[PDB]
Design a binder for this molecule. Structure first.
Ligand SMILES: NC[C@@H]1O[C@H](O[C@H]2[C@@H](O)[C@H](O[C@@H]3[C@@H](O)[C@H](N)C[C@H](N)[C@H]3O[C@H]3O[C@H](CO)[C@@H](O)[C@H](O)[C@H]3N)O[C@@H]2CO)[C@H](N)[C@@H](O)[C@@H]1O
Ligand SMILES: NC[C@@H]1O[C@H](O[C@H]2[C@@H](O)[C@H](O[C@@H]3[C@@H](O)[C@H](N)C[C@H](N)[C@H]3O[C@H]3O[C@H](CO)[C@@H](O)[C@H](O)[C@H]3N)O[C@@H]2CO)[C@H](N)[C@@H](O)[C@@H]1O
Ligand SMILES: NC[C@@H]1O[C@H](O[C@H]2[C@@H](O)[C@H](O[C@@H]3[C@@H](O)[C@H](N)C[C@H](N)[C@H]3O[C@H]3O[C@H](CO)[C@@H](O)[C@H](O)[C@H]3N)O[C@@H]2CO)[C@H](N)[C@@H](O)[C@@H]1O
Ligand SMILES: [Mg+2]
Ligand SMILES: [Mg+2]
Ligand SMILES: [Mg+2]
Ligand SMILES: [Mg+2]
Ligand SMILES: [Mg+2]
Ligand SMILES: [Mg+2]
Ligand SMILES: [Mg+2]
Ligand SMILES: [Mg+2]
Ligand SMILES: [Mg+2]
Ligand SMILES: [Mg+2]
Ligand SMILES: [Mg+2]
Ligand SMILES: [Mg+2]
Ligand SMILES: [Mg+2]
Ligand SMILES: [Mg+2]
Ligand SMILES: [Mg+2]
Ligand SMILES: [Mg+2]
Ligand SMILES: [Mg+2]
Ligand SMILES: [Mg+2]
Ligand SMILES: [Mg+2]
Ligand SMILES: [Mg+2]
Ligand SMILES: [Mg+2]
Ligand SMILES: [Mg+2]
Ligand SMILES: [Mg+2]
Ligand SMILES: [Mg+2]
Ligand SMILES: [Mg+2]
Ligand SMILES: [Mg+2]
Ligand SMILES: [Mg+2]
Ligand SMILES: [Mg+2]
Ligand SMILES: [Mg+2]
Ligand SMILES: [Mg+2]
Ligand SMILES: [Mg+2]
Ligand SMILES: [Mg+2]
Ligand SMILES: [Mg+2]
Ligand SMILES: [Mg+2]
Ligand SMILES: [Mg+2]
Ligand SMILES: [Mg+2]
Ligand SMILES: [Mg+2]
Ligand SMILES: [Mg+2]
Ligand SMILES: [Mg+2]
Ligand SMILES: [Mg+2]
Ligand SMILES: [Mg+2]
Ligand SMILES: [Mg+2]
Ligand SMILES: [Mg+2]
Ligand SMILES: [Mg+2]
Ligand SMILES: [Mg+2]
Lengths: 148, 58, 194, 203, 99
RNA sequence: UUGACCUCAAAUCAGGUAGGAGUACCCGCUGAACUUAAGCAUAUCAAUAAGCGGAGGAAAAGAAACCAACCGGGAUUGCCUUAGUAACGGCGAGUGAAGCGGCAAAAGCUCAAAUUUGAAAUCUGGUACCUUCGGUGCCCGAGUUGUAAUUUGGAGAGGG
RNA sequence: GUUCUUUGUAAAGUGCCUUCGAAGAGUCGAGUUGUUUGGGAAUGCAGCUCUAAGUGGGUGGUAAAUUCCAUCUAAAGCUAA
RNA sequence: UUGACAUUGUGAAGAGA
């Protein structure tokens, strides 16, 4: 609010906080991003390197969701199993009745390889899993099932 | 026309004066191919009095 | 100008934007009046529930194809499969969509089921005004909700057939890439006929 | 049904036949008024196709228009502005002569309603058009239920507002990705995406 | 066609019990259509050939056919919409010699 | 000699209609420069101001020559988000939408091209007569260079 | 909620066989010019020039030839919220 | 101002690589 603002502190002092020599003018240096290649060069390199020019390849009519692959890790995994059942399924450690985790229906659809998991087995229903992810699921005695 | 296409008529009378002339000119080439004998006649309005109206064409 | 270390912004306000500016102060009254506009429809519309029955439809692309969605209308196959005509299916309130053909059975089943099951819970008044007093249900879609087809079961046995699920996608995509390269080297192999 | 013959006939215009009909009539059009009454459609099939019927209260008018680039009505050729707006000569109207025709004849009969129009003839100086007007005052059209929507004041001078077949063309109204600009209506759709929407609880 | 049920691949997709819809009338807008096919063929020779159609066939039965496809693509303003006119001329060329 | 026809005229012919105002919003046309780029010409301002034609209570848009490429979706409009993104850009200053998804509201449709051909089944007016947003009978007119029914692609028609 | 009239020597719905199924041009499309667009070998718009087809046609956001695939049916029309 | 294309139809001779 205004009563907190420093411009109430400056009432009575000539020139607000703006200085006697340099004042506060309209647009010294020019409006906006003007002169980035010239008098603002030093600021565009240093804090925005790469800002000028082109790099790489264009894409016409690019629509995201051609690319949709929300990423999930063994780092979590078991979160996708509700809390209480998660206990008894960990207790089971069965190759006979083993919990099914459908990643795509869980908001996901690529499974990555970060972090350790228990020896308890998992049926991983997914699409697009990473090489190291799977192999770590084999350490738990479990499989991955590709779907769409 | 539908008759001449279906071969259900014998004598056709096509008047000389019709604007547009496209309303007709295809018939003498059509009435021959469909084997219906036809006659180009005077009196677009003469053929009409035959049929109770002011004008006729076919 | 340009100073300190700050992200570059893009603020499109050079255009007389202060001309075309919409506050919504009416969000209150555009609701209070959005309600009263619905309230007296159902009044004027009498026991009928404000909306048509709407189908169950899969929804598109690679992102939202997982879920299932209410479509526009029931299409044609399902309407006769529900035992009634299009022209009547709109008189009993139901959504008829003449486009959107049926390429999927599991949906086509559930949808025709959704129709008869609708025809069940209704009561369709006669020509006359002598009718059983008609307590009015306002909702329809929430009276006939749409579940999510259950797919799998809760637990199973590990079936490991010895495949690398990763290596599949490698070989599934490698297959996609080289088709036209392997059809052409067979195309040049059939030219070995001298 | 004789109509489809004329419809396929006319579809061969550079035919040895129609060039005669073309030349003969196009001269007859010039001798007459720029805007004049035609007591019956040159094309009975095309007018048909667009909703012309032979009942009382339908009217057909024929008109000439002046064919080609619009010149800046700028006095010396002097633009008085930046070099991009300097242009005078090679400049194209954003509407078609057909639409220019509908408007000028829609003005002559101020009591009728423009329904549609079709091309008939052209030479270097003129394109020639016949325009279908529907008398909204005439009882035959008022009591005919497949028409009398034109008696609705909504449709007053639908040619000026670009609500005819040509209008929506030039106005650009079509579904699809190519019509994004001016499908919902141009300025409407501009002003829309140029609006700042501020709610009570800001987002 | 037949969906491999895999995340990605050549035919990749989801496996669903495969129905098939009854075709739509709309889908045939080509419409052989007896009345049309006969009415146009009648008209076709009443008005005769047109100044470009004429010198188009003069090109074919004189030097070149590929030559006549050049002018065909130019005059009608497309490639695969030319050949339909070009080959059509080879039909009209059979109105003469081989009956 | 007499009678129609096409076309085209006239009347203080019988009945009507258009104009002008308003302009916040709405459909189009036409169309800037100040300005920004620390100069300036492309660019920006802006598909804006000014000028012009046409409406309604809303206008417009609309039952797809759509979107997608999915297990597909399904008239249009608007909100939310896509997104300051894809892309455009002395690739500089700057500009910049769309498909999906949630919600508001939801509504679908008709002509043209078909022989009633064992019957113009259609219609405007005039007129008396009444029960007068009109109804019947009679009569002139329209109309076969096509008025009615029937059909609109989701079909559908003829037959059986 | 009243009691009439009798609309029906009309109209609509639905089953099955076989045949047929007309669907819009100086248009679509193209070239070029201008303009416009985020639309980039060209987003729309218009001028002139060329000018289609009917298992055809349009779209599929990198131009072309070739081969397929997907999806809609232009160039006529009405409609509340 | 010059060329082209279109308005643009009907004929005849006698000449060009
Ligand atoms: N960045 C976009 C959005 O900006 C918003 O910005 C909010 C704040 O950052 C902003 O605060 C500004 C402050 O930025 C600025 N440097 C100083 C100023 N006094 C503040 O403004 C504040 O105080 C004034 C004075 O009473 C009030 O009138 C104003 O409503 C209030 N927001 O007020 C904004 C709301 O009006 C929020 N950060 C957030 O919703 C989002 O980031
Ligand atoms: N994207 C949709 C829009 O998001 C807006 O919200 C934006 C901002 O409010 C929010 O910005 C917050 C800022 O509020 C807060 N005070 C500081 C915070 N660091 C900012 O976040 C920012 O930095 C973080 C971390 O680096 C990143 O997520 C990202 O670069 C950016 N959002 O980040 C949001 C990114 O969009 C508004 N809610 C609204 O206009 C609209 O929903
Ligand atoms: N082609 C065989 C079948 O023909 C059917 O033909 C339709 C009509 O031709 C058929 O005739 C109906 C009849 O059902 C109903 N009970 C009596 C009614 N008068 C008839 O109606 C019809 O016939 C009259 C002539 O009588 C015509 O004016 C016109 O074709 C139509 N109105 O009734 C069908 C209703 O759909 C359908 N097109 C379809 O079931 C199927 O194609
Ligand atoms: Mg203080
Ligand atoms: Mg002080
Ligand atoms: Mg002091
Ligand atoms: Mg001081
Ligand atoms: Mg002082
Ligand atoms: Mg200070
Ligand atoms: Mg000072
Ligand atoms: Mg200073
Ligand atoms: Mg840059
Ligand atoms: Mg609702
Ligand atoms: Mg004169
Ligand atoms: Mg008349
Ligand atoms: Mg000027
Ligand atoms: Mg100027
Ligand atoms: Mg259109
Ligand atoms: Mg008078
Ligand atoms: Mg006025
Ligand atoms: Mg005005
Ligand atoms: Mg400057
Ligand atoms: Mg300056
Ligand atoms: Mg200066
Ligand atoms: Mg501009
Ligand atoms: Mg203005
Ligand atoms: Mg008013
Ligand atoms: Mg309203
Ligand atoms: Mg409207
Ligand atoms: Mg349709
Ligand atoms: Mg939609
Ligand atoms: Mg550009
Ligand atoms: Mg530069
Ligand atoms: Mg920038
Ligand atoms: Mg812009
Ligand atoms: Mg835009
Ligand atoms: Mg009457
Ligand atoms: Mg009367
Ligand atoms: Mg069409
Ligand atoms: Mg302009
Ligand atoms: Mg262009
Ligand atoms: Mg196709
Ligand atoms: Mg349409
Ligand atoms: Mg409309
Ligand atoms: Mg409406
Ligand atoms: Mg010259
Ligand atoms: Mg010369
Ligand atoms: Mg010449």
């Amino acid at each position: 609010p205004s009563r907190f603002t420093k411009t109430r502190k400056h009432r009575g002092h000539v020139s607000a906080g703006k200085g006697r020599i340099g004042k506060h003018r309209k647009h010294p240096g020019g409006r906006g991003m003007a002169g980035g290649q010239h008098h603002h060069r030093i600021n565009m390199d240093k804090y925005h390197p790469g800002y000028f020019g082109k790099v790489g390849m264009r894409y016409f009519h690019k629509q995201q969701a051609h690319f949709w692959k929300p990423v999930l890790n063994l780092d979590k995994l078991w979160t996708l199993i509700p809390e209480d059942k998660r206990d008894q399924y960990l207790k089971s450690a069965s190759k006979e009745t083993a919990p099914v985790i459908d990643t795509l229906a869980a908001g996901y659809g690529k499974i990555l390889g970060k972090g350790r998991i228990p020896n308890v087995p998992v049926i991983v229903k997914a699409r697009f899993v990473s090489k190291l992810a799977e192999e770590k699921i084999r350490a738990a005695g479990g499989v991955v099932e590709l779907i769409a | 026309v539908a008759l001449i296409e279906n071969k259900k008529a014998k004598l056709v009378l096509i008047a000389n004066d019709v604007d547009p002339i496209e309303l007709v000119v295809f018939l003498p080439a059509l009435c021959k191919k469909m084997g219906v004998p036809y006659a180009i006649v005077k009196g677009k309005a003469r053929l009409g009095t035959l049929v109770n109206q002011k004008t006729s064409a076919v | 100008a340009i100073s300190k270390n700050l992200p570059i912004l893009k603020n499109h306000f050079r255009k007389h934007w202060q001309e075309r500016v919409k506050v919504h102060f009416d969000q209150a009254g555009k609701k209070v009046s959005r309600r009263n506009a619905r309230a007296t429809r159902a009044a004027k519309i009498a026991p009928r529930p404000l909306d048509l029955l709407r189908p169950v439809v899969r929804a598109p692309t690679v992102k939202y194809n997982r879920k299932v969605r209410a479509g526009r209308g029931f299409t044609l196959a399902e309407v006769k499969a529900a035992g009634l005509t299009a022209a009547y299916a709109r008189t009993i309130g139901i959504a008829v969509d003449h486009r959107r053909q049926n390429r999927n059975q599991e949906i086509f089943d559930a949808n025709v089921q959704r129709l008869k099951e609708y025809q069940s819970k209704i009561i369709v008044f006669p020509r006359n005004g002598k009718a059983p007093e008609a307590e009015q249900v306002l909702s329809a879609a929430a009276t006939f909700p749409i579940a999510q087809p259950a797919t799998d079961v809760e637990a199973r046995a590990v079936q490991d057939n010895g495949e690398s699920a990763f290596r599949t996608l490698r070989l599934a995509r490698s297959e996609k890439k080289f088709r036209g390269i392997r059809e052409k080297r067979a195309r040049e192999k059939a030219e070995a006929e001298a | 049904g004789a109509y489809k013959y004329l419809e396929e006939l006319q579809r061969k215009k550079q035919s040895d036949v129609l060039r005669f009909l073309q030349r003969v009539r196009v001269w007859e059009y010039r001798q007459k008024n720029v805007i004049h009454r035609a007591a019956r459609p040159t094309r009975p099939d095309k007018a048909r196709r667009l909703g012309y019927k032979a009942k009382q209260g339908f009217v057909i008018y024929r008109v000439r228009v002046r064919r080609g680039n619009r010149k800046r009505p700028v006095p010396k050729g002097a633009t008085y502005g930046k070099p991009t707006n300097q242009g005078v000569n090679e400049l194209k109207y954003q509407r078609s002569l057909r639409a220019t025709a509908e408007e000028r004849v829609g003005r002559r009969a101020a009591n009728l309603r423009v329904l549609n129009s079709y091309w008939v003839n052209q030479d270097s100086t003129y394109k020639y058009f016949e325009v279908i007007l529907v008398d909204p005052q005439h009882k035959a059209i008022r009591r005919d239920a497949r028409y009398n929507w034109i008696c609705d004041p909504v449709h007053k001078h639908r040619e000026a507002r670009g609500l005819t077949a040509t209008g929506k063309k030039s106005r650009g109204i079509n579904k699809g990705h190519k019509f994004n600009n001016t499908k919902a209506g141009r300025r409407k759709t501009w002003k829309r995406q140029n609006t700042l929407s501020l709610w009570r609880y800001r987002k | 066609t037949v969906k491999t049920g895999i995340a990605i691949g050549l035919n990749k997709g989801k496996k669903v019990t495969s129905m098939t819809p009854a075709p739509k009338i709309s889908y045939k807008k080509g419409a052989a259509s007896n009345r049309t096919k006969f009415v146009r063929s009648l008209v076709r020779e009443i008005a005769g050939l047109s100044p470009y159609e004429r010198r188009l066939i003069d090109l074919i039965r004189n030097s070149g056919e590929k030559r006549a496809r050049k002018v065909a693509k130019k005059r009608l303003g497309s490639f695969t919409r030319a050949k339909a006119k070009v080959e059509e001329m080879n039909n009209i060329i059979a109105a003469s010699r081989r009956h």
